[PDB]
Design a protein around this ligand. Structure first.
Ligand SMILES: Cc1cc2nc3c(=O)[nH]c(=O)nc-3n(C[C@H](O)[C@H](O)[C@H](O)COP(=O)(O)OP(=O)(O)OC[C@H]3O[C@@H](n4cnc5c(N)ncnc54)[C@H](O)[C@@H]3O)c2cc1C
Ligand SMILES: Cc1cc2nc3c(=O)[nH]c(=O)nc-3n(C[C@H](O)[C@H](O)[C@H](O)COP(=O)(O)OP(=O)(O)OC[C@H]3O[C@@H](n4cnc5c(N)ncnc54)[C@H](O)[C@@H]3O)c2cc1C
Ligand SMILES: NC(=O)c1ccc[n+]([C@@H]2O[C@H](COP(=O)([O-])OP(=O)(O)OC[C@H]3O[C@@H](n4cnc5c(N)ncnc54)[C@H](OP(=O)(O)O)[C@@H]3O)[C@@H](O)[C@H]2O)c1
Ligand SMILES: NC(=O)c1ccc[n+]([C@@H]2O[C@H](COP(=O)([O-])OP(=O)(O)OC[C@H]3O[C@@H](n4cnc5c(N)ncnc54)[C@H](OP(=O)(O)O)[C@@H]3O)[C@@H](O)[C@H]2O)c1
Lengths: 484, 485
């Protein structure tokens, strides 16, 4: 009957994971992926947001910046390095792009290998079980399939103000900028804004972050506020409670000069500044509006763009499933998308009954001083169980490696959130320090095991590594005792 | 009435932990700590092995060598740095000793603050409840207490071959060495041996390792072999199955020149080589022989020197307890010493009833490429549960940060051992890669919770970080499938 057993719209994290898992059980699978250019014309290869314009490029630039701090730290350890080393933007972009290009290609090869058909075409539903796919030259073809999986990701959102689409860049553009950004204004104050500002400042640039309200809305504000302070102390300038209303080009160039006009969120005062680059990092929009979901009856939430699904990634229309950043009320991260994609396939074609668990998924914000978390923030814990039933254990720490260079004492921070009414179940894990991701992974598998403060107390730390701090936390926030 | 509620012999990791924990509950406490010099005369302050000649200086040196790699790596990320940077041994040592100084002082101040009496004197039992203390000038005093705690640690072991104590250095000396070691020979093949060899190589010295039998005896041999290959593929030279028999001084200096003569372990072959420094890292001896244990009746293991003890750190003599390295069949690690000390005090003075858990204690070998482990090695597991009931999941992995420098793909390696007869519980965890301590700590807490492979699979990884590799292991050793990248 149908052309394919399964057609996947979108070839990023979720989509490709699902493709390969499906092909393994002998299914006839087709993957559609197309990358609509950026206002400025930026486009990229197979792989999704993470491979081309997210995790991978972000992490590598994070490292270019960390290596800069490494150069400095090397002097007090004996390395005869100059006091000021220069960084080359072009050289860096070329390296990051070579690596990205290698993954574009590897993905392509992995599909050919697993017998998955790849079509570099934009897909959209035209009627029950059928879809139109349009390539770059506009040529079209229609395909049918027993089931469909929607995995289209999202894209950088805009402000809708004069000059935005014309002179600004977003995360889609940054990772391949053909010239050094120069003085930079980054607008927004969550994951993307802070990580990007963080690495831009780390390789030597003049960076300013314009915040509308608070930093990292949704995360523990105690932790967010310390991430903010660390960035301030370390270079990045902030403009608080202001939003840009107009961006104008004082002059074109590589880079040129730009004029940004901003207004208070609680006053009528207005300000203005001059920057070489203005990056917008104010959110991302689900790519669910233009794929013909009406022609096949899939309901979304027309307010947010997200597709509500069952706890098996099934939408209202039964033969159509969705995974990834587009889901409503889930977790927007690469490994979550991969897990959903692999399990989905396993439940469809391998008789599995295991579902993806979106609870206590750990994350790490790659700011100059990394932030790792899993579970509840303190705010959300007090709320869910009651202040009277929450005990918070915390402590500053100083990475051994920092003592010789003699910097940042008592800037790193660890805290766990315990539920008194439940044998002190560790409901929240937060860490601000080097290698936060490496430190958090294992604790996340311990929260899945029901870790209790008692069990944690009885785990012996490894000396001398940062993670050990969690092994001996004794001061509570309630007790009022200092931890400085 | 005795002079003190408790006297601690040893002001290192276990001793100082228990001291502070016991002074917490208002008991009168005294801590005796003395550092008898090395054959070459090296001595140091309060703190113990870790502080002055172990963990701390070791890791800091491991770091000087990681930074060397960071400088190399920095070029492809765009930093304009020289293809080759020179390293100053003096600046490095002077920096490490300035930090050790701080800790010595800090530790003294902590003792003062908790109202703990500190005698920089050598201690030994003389009769029931009584002890003699000798300071540096020979002046002695006698003290009594209701209870005693032995926490004396150990000291580098020597070979007993011509020239060893005369011309060789041990970890006690390396960390304060007043001159760059130059071409170096490291005898031994475990923790100290590989870590030290690893970092002298990392700062640019010619380094060689002489190995009697196998590497890291006791550890997983698959992991051990790989740590080996990594070191070999990254400079470090190995001489296998030989043992030195004579060290002689071709010429004194700073450094001088030495000739080492060694002999095969399975033939009559004999070889010789010239080195500037020869470091012995062949073990450590419990400091339990000269503390007057007979005058008070504490029974030890005459062979090993390790004090046997109850699951409460209590010796044969009721009011005499022991913690730390000297214990027999426990875990010779700083954090374990600390746990025992603190908990011992809690049980004595605070009604606690919690004993120190010596099972599945984690550890990390800080070699050039780090190795973290917790639980059972593969061999150890197969033994205990039967080969037919062990499923091993494993994989190579390539840190994202290494792709741009374009180096060492397929070198890092991860592996877990599951017991199939027990819901595939994770009985063993091993990882060879960067920041292996940071990656291992949390998983050690998961093993404490009875982590099962199924729960591990249900844990979502953090991307892109190395530990995420444990999140998605699907290839079993039994299956035969390849695990390359
Ligand atoms: C700057 C940045 C940094 C990030 N860092 C991290 C991190 O460190 N760790 C982490 O876990 N997550 C990170 N994320 C989030 C991560 O990128 C997403 O969670 C992940 O990419 C989601 O995968 P996906 O499949 O759901 O969507 P995507 O990966 O974006 O895949 C969607 C693909 O579908 C294509 N597509 C869309 N519509 C169509 C259509 N109609 N036809 C054909 N193809 C179509 C798209 O062009 C895209 O290539 C980051 C995101 C950004 C933006
Ligand atoms: C090179 C090296 C690196 C190491 N690295 C690590 C690591 O990374 N992580 C880790 O967990 N462990 C490490 N260890 C092991 C760790 O240092 C020990 O496990 C720990 O120090 C044991 O503490 P302790 O109190 O039991 O004995 P110690 O800490 O050694 O304290 C014993 C003290 O007692 C003193 N003393 C002895 N006899 C007397 C006496 N009669 N009177 C007065 N004082 C006396 C000694 O001089 C010494 O200062 C390392 C060891 C070495 C040698
Ligand atoms: N390391 C990682 O794992 C990682 C890193 C980066 C991105 N990501 C993924 O990418 C997603 C998108 O991140 P994002 O940071 O772009 O957005 P986000 O998480 O939705 O945050 C939007 C940010 O922009 C601000 N903002 C919104 N509208 C604004 C306006 N008109 N003017 C000024 N500021 C405005 C918000 O402030 P208010 O508080 O005022 O709303 C907030 O700081 C993440 O949520 C995550 O799923 C993951
Ligand atoms: N990272 C950490 O936590 C860490 C780091 C360093 C030290 N430590 C602590 O310090 C303890 C002692 O360390 P260690 O490495 O010195 O000793 P060890 O663990 O006892 O191992 C001794 C090593 O020396 C070899 N050897 C013994 N006698 C020899 C001889 N006559 N000639 C040549 N080689 C000989 C052994 O080989 P065989 O196999 O033939 O015996 C073995 O490789 C550890 O067990 C640990 O408690 C911990």
């Amino acid at each position: 009957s149908y052309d394919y057993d399964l057609i996947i719209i979108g070839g990023g994290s979720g989509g490709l994971a699902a493709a390969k898992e499906a092909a393994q059980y002998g299914k006839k699978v087709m993957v559609l992926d197309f990358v609509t250019p950026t206002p400025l014309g930026t486009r990229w290869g197979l792989g999704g947001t993470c491979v081309n314009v997210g995790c991978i490029p972000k992490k590598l630039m994070h490292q270019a910046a960390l290596l800069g701090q490494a150069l400095q730290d090397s002097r007090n350890y004996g390395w005869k390095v100059e006091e000021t080393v220069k960084h080359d933007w072009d050289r860096m972009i070329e390296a990051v792009q070579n690596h990205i290009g290698s993954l574009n290609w590897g993905y392509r090869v992995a599909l050919r290998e697993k017998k998955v058909v790849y079509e570099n075409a934009y897909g959209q539903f035209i009627g029950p079980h059928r879809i139109k796919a349009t390539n770059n030259k506009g040529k079209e073809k229609i395909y049918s399939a027993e089931r469909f999986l929607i995995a289209t990701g999202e894209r950088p959102r805009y402000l809708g103000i004069p000059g935005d689409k014309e002179y600004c860049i977003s995360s889609d553009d940054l990772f391949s900028l053909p010239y050094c950004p120069g003085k930079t204004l980054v607008v927004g104050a969550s994951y993307v804004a802070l990580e990007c500002a963080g690495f831009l400042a780390g390789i030597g640039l003049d960076v300013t972050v314009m915040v509308r309200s608070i930093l990292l809305r949704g995360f523990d504000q105690d932790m967010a506020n310390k991430i903010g302070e660390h960035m301030e102390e370390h270079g990045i300038k902030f403009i608080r409670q202001f939003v840009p209303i107009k961006v104008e080009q004082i002059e074109a160039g590589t880079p040129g000069r730009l004029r940004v006009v901003a207004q208070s969120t609680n006053s009528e005062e207005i300000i203005e500044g001059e920057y070489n680059t203005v990056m917008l990092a104010i959110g991302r929009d689900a790519c669910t509006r233009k794929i013909g979901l009406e022609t096949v009856g899939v309901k979304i939430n027309e307010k947010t763009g997200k597709i509500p699904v069952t706890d098996e990634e099934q939408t209202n229309v039964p033969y159509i499933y969705a995974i990834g950043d587009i889901l409503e009320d889930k977790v927007e991260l690469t490994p979550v998308a991969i897990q959903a994609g692999r399990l989905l396939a396993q439940r469809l074609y391998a008789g599995s009954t295991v579902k993806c668990d979106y609870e206590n998924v750990p994350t790490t914000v790659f700011t100059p001083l990394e932030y790792g978390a899993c579970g509840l923030s303190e705010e959300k814990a007090v709320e869910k169980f009651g202040e009277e039933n929450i005990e918070v254990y915390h402590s500053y720490f100083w990475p051994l490696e920092w003592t010789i260079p003699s910097r940042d004492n008592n800037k790193c921070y660890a805290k766990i959130i315990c539920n008194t009414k439940d044998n002190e179940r560790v409901v929240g894990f937060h860490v601000l320090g080097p290698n936060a991701g490496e430190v958090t992974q294992g604790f996340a598998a311990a929260l899945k095991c029901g870790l209790t403060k008692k069990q944690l107390d009885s785990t012996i730390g490894i000396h001398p590594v940062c993670a050990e701090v969690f092994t001996t936390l004794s001061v509570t926030k309630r007790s009022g005792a200092s931890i400085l």
